[PDB]
């Protein structure tokens, strides 16, 4: 291929500079403002180097310790040319690891480079050609019962994960494949209960092609949008067959770290019994959403009806013939209001701030179609290549990729949007018009994927009062800042959640929560994501300022992909490897 | 272009030309005089191999009116290849009611072998890929019934207020696979299984047991084992997998339910099946009954002199719980088959005095050698890397007519013998009686012909070859005395326990005990090819007797086989069941007549 020669020569110069510990020379091969996003392989971190000077500074600090380095076109792949961009899958090696990557080249200059870590040399996963035999040509069940009785009691785990939802289960499967002895702590009774507990009608709003767990993808006949209990069944059965050590009915009560011994002391209550676990690494996988935001409205003590945060709302059944006011317009607000109307309960939504609304069909086609769809698969974009393609766009410029996508969504769904506005609903498209994904990555909230509620709003079936605040709650009403008085038997506060940092404050200490800082967000200086720029998700899947404390989570996509780089970092430290973190992120917000 | 594509595509259009022309004799003229057309449902509504031009013409003359118009072409995205004078190509075939994949071999301008299969019924395709269910019903409703509610409704109504179309007896690997395929075709089906949980059929075996077939060969439909799954799966890990598979594939699986009896009423077209679901009687009235109770039938119990005199324990291999109770005892196992080898190796690991007593020869193959030389080309990592997917692997194997399979296998097992020659020499020198099939065609051919007579060695044969398991061969049982067993060479073995590892009768014995001896006789022997070899008498039948296809008893079907055959032939059985559920015209051609009652 005519492009293979072009890309391979650029890669050879890069390879030459990297072997020579020539940081400046390597950076000169990039565009002046080019990007190098590294996932563990060079930085022992999740780090995006922006521009030649940052690129050179990383290479000057890391190259001496990783030699010899190779980088070349990936086996079986070829370079392609689109829109003036030369791109190719690549393979990259250090002295202790290998990985795949992706490179984009323009006018002979590296525009973007992705390096990732796939495996640690000598600790490769027993997959494919390396499969365990299973049988020798003490039984398999006996050994499992041995591990169930000894791990966490007579013998301590290397790693403890708090939280057995989708995120901890995926991370646990990955850790199991790396022989990192691990216990998952889950206060629910069974795996999958994290999803069973939602409202009757809930389904995933992300599509199947985007949603796979590691190792066992959903089958070709699995539904596009999975009902909440069908997810539960899958997670429970995934947990069994991937041989996880999963302590259900077990609450984590407290944890602390002793830098002297390098050990945590984690106090749990397993079916009522106190147990003390002493792992070397602690992972919080308690959900990206932390502590509920409770408003401080005048007269909340005067109101004689029920007040619930959206997280304490059981559903519409108890409220036939009653009147509900939902304070909020996020997706929790839309879910709760659509259920109350389907049940024939009087519901009013009170919106103070704008919301980004996207029709499910439009999100699936225009925003996910290129990477996660039947069309994507037929074109060869496998789930792994999709994850790596998305990861290869530096967060700095992703909004630029996204803007045309969500402009097309507005033109397609314009009539839908007009009717929402004519009704008085406050629309936005992210602070910079870059859309749903960027809001999710920046603030983890502020959007609703419409599966039926927005039409109920446009048609007036869900009553809307927007543009107003709450003045006070009276004895049987809530009074809005324009003077409107809404009678209310039940007030639901759909006011969101703080960051995961609240989990650390509640389980470790507020002092440790302060060391760690706000979790999630990019530092984009937009709503609920204050600057300055950090360029990677705050405290996710990477070293934190609290030693041996980690955060895992995200949506099913991010949990699938970044559980790989988190587990490889946990494994590397279990093997006593040298892991010199570059550019460890300084804390700019205590929450 | 491809120069082989043109040759094959021209041969195929002549075939298609003749078929649209209702030219049975002319279409047959396109095969070698003795060519083969193996059909899986698509043309014959049967599993049927047409052998020779006269049979081909007769089938085509009988069926063509029922399946026209027929299209047959090279498969989309595939190309013909030529090797050793043989032209091959994947093909795609459509009828007026169905579509499917096929495979064609051509030599000197004549069709040597044709494989036609049915993949789907037109208008009843599976909800997969582009046709996935949405799962969620978007848009507001007040009559909303959630996924969990509908599932709880079906559990409560099916078999009570509403009868299933099909009932499967047996919830092992075979019934679970078939159940999955039937749920994908919206054939309401109840699995009846007397064990408590799905997967218990594997949990029930001895501690150390693993699959002796490798993972690449073993997948269940729809959810393959993952890339980190072990080659040889321990039995309890197989149990957990089936238990998860049954849950996530939405099977209606009545555990703790024994099937007591069933009878068919040709007037109503209904079965009456009496079950005990947790002790409580239920009466099920399906239109179709599938027996999936395992290929092994009634245990064969020997008639030895003095069995009534022996003062120790006597067990059939199927009644032997394991070595635990026999710490200080002396065991004699009468048999040298696979049950006997498993039981003896377990007794020897536990330090029990065990002697194996062999009368007839056994075929021994090392698990590792089966994996490389017998399965390596189709079911391996190298096969996958070469584009041979599990389904392409299944179709390639199915594309070899059974009449010629034995000669493909002979060089495979000549190679296995040369590789393991010292192993075999030490077994023969120790006095173990070896064979390699009646015509030296090896393990897979015995299995297809008689379903017995072999043991895949995972460690026990070395214990025999080295004398750790004591061997007495070439002998029968003369009599049991009060505390000993006497062999036909005069040896008197002291014995606390005698295990009779003497195999099983045919699967139709299940039909005898659950339906009636008359129905069992009408159905006849199950399994076997009619190969005129040991335990497989002629005449030649060419397909597994009564497997995955219509039987001489109306609305009675048999499902089973190894994980490979269950995976693959459950597709054709479920489609035949689905076609009848939708009231399609299904004219069976060449329905096999019974030549043996058992
Ligand atoms: C309508 C709707 C649709 C959605 N669709 C999708 C979708 O398609 N894809 C997607 O990725 N997300 C979707 N989400 C979001 C989904 O809720 C989260 O993404 C999901 O919960 C992932 O969270 P997690 O596994 O990281 O943590 P969680 O799901 O919150 O689980 C964390 C677990 O930690 C446990 N826990 C907490 N504290 C303790 C303690 N002290 N001791 C022990 N255990 C503890 C909890 O019981 C919980 O089970 C949807 C949400 C809604 C409302
Ligand atoms: C060491 C060893 C290794 C093996 N490895 C393999 C391998 O790798 N691959 C392979 O394919 N095979 C293997 N086998 C063979 C295996 O035992 C059978 O192939 C397997 O059981 C398939 O049978 P099945 O699921 O069709 O029926 P079965 O497993 O026999 O199950 C039929 C079920 O029907 C139930 N049943 C019977 N009567 C009734 C009734 N009246 N009411 C309700 N339920 C009833 C039984 O409880 C049983 O669970 C191995 C065997 C051994 C000993």
From TrEMBL, chain B:
InterPro entries: Auxin_biosynth/cation_transpt (IPR050982), FAD/NAD-bd_sf (IPR036188), NTF2-like_dom_sf (IPR032710)
GO MF annotation list: flavin adenine dinucleotide binding; monooxygenase activity
Regions annotated as coiled coil: none
UniProt cross-references to Pfam families, sorted A to Z: Pyr_redox_3
Keywords, comma-separated and alphabetical: FAD, Flavoprotein, Nucleotide-binding, Oxidoreductase
Annotated spans, Disordered: 128-147
Positions annotated to bind FAD: 173-174, 193-194, 205, 212-213, 259, 561, 563
Domain of life the protein comes from: Bacteria
Protein's recorded name: FAD-dependent oxidoreductase
Provenance organism: Janthinobacterium svalbardensis
Classification of source organism: Bacteria, Pseudomonadati, Pseudomonadota, Betaproteobacteria, Burkholderiales
């Amino acid at each position: 291929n005519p492009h293979d020669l072009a890309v391979a020569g650029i890669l050879e110069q890069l390879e030459g500079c990297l072997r020579a510990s020539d940081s400046t020379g390597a950076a000169q091969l990039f565009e002046p403002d080019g990007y190098w996003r590294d996932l563990v392989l060079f930085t022992w971190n999740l780090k995006t180097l922006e521009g030649r000077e940052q690129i050179a500074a990383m290479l000057a600090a890391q190259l001496g310790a990783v030699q010899p380095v190779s980088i070349r076109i990936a086996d079986g792949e070829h370079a392609v040319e689109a829109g003036g961009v030369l791109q190719s899958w690549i393979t990259v090696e250090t002295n202790v690891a290998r990985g795949v990557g992706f490179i984009r080249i323009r006018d002979g200059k590296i525009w973007t480079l992705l390096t990732t870590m796939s495996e640690l040399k000598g600790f490769e996963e027993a997959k494919g050609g390396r499969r365990p035999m299973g049988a020798e040509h003490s039984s398999w069940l006996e050994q499992r019962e041995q591990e169930a009785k000894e791990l966490g009691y007579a013998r301590q785990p290397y790693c403890v994960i708090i939280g057995g939802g989708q995120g901890g289960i995926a991370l646990g499967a990955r850790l199991r494949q790396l022989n990192v002895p691990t216990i998952i702590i889950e206060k629910n009774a069974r795996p999958g209960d994290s999803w069973r507990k939602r409202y009757k009608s809930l389904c995933l709003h992300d599509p199947v092609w985007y949603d796979h767990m590691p190792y066992i993808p959903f089958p070709d006949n699995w539904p596009v949008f999975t009902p909440k209990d069908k997810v539960g069944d899958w997670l429970e059965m995934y947990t069994k067959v991937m041989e996880l050590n999963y302590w259900g009915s077990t609450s984590c009560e407290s944890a602390s770290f002793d830098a002297a011994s390098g050990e945590w002391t984690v106090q749990v209550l397993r079916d009522g019994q106190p147990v003390t676990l002493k792992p070397k690494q602690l992972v919080l996988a308690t959900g990206m959403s932390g502590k509920a935001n409770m408003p401080k409205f005048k007269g909340m003590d005067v109101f004689q009806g029920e007040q619930q945060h959206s997280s304490q709302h059981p559903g519409p059944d108890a409220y036939a013939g009653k009147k509900v006011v939902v304070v909020g317009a996020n997706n929790s607000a839309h879910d709760i209001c659509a259920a109350l109307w389907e049940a024939g309960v009087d519901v009013t939504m009170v919106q103070r701030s704008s919301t980004h609304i996207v029709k499910s069909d439009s999100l699936m086609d225009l925003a996910l179609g290129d990477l996660y769809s039947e069309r994507a698969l037929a074109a060869g974009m496998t789930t792994n290549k999709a994850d790596l393609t998305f990861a290869s766009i530096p967060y700095k410029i992703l909004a630029n990729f996204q803007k045309p996508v969500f402009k097309a969504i507005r033109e397609r769904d314009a009539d839908f949007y007009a009717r929402l506005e004519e009704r008085g609903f406050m629309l936005d498209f992210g602070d910079d018009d870059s859309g749903l994904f960027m809001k999710y990555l920046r603030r983890g909230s502020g959007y609703y994927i419409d599966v039926g509620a927005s039409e109920l709003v446009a048609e007036g079936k869900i009553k809307l009062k927007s543009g107003v605040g709450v003045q006070e709650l009276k004895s049987h009403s809530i009074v809005l800042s324009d003077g409107t008085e809404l009678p209310a038997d039940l007030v639901v506060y759909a006011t969101g959640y703080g960051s995961m940092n609240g989990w650390a404050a509640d389980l470790i200490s507020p002092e440790v929560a302060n060391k760690v800082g706000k979790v999630w967000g990019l530092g984009s200086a937009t709503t609920k994501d204050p600057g300055p720029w950090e360029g990677e998700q705050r405290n996710m899947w990477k070293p934190t300022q609290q030693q041996a404390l980690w955060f895992h989570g995200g949506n099913l996509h991010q949990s699938r992909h970044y559980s790989q780089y988190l587990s490889l970092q946990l494994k590397a430290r279990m093997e006593g490897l040298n892991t010199p973190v570059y550019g460890q992120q300084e804390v700019h917000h205590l929450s």
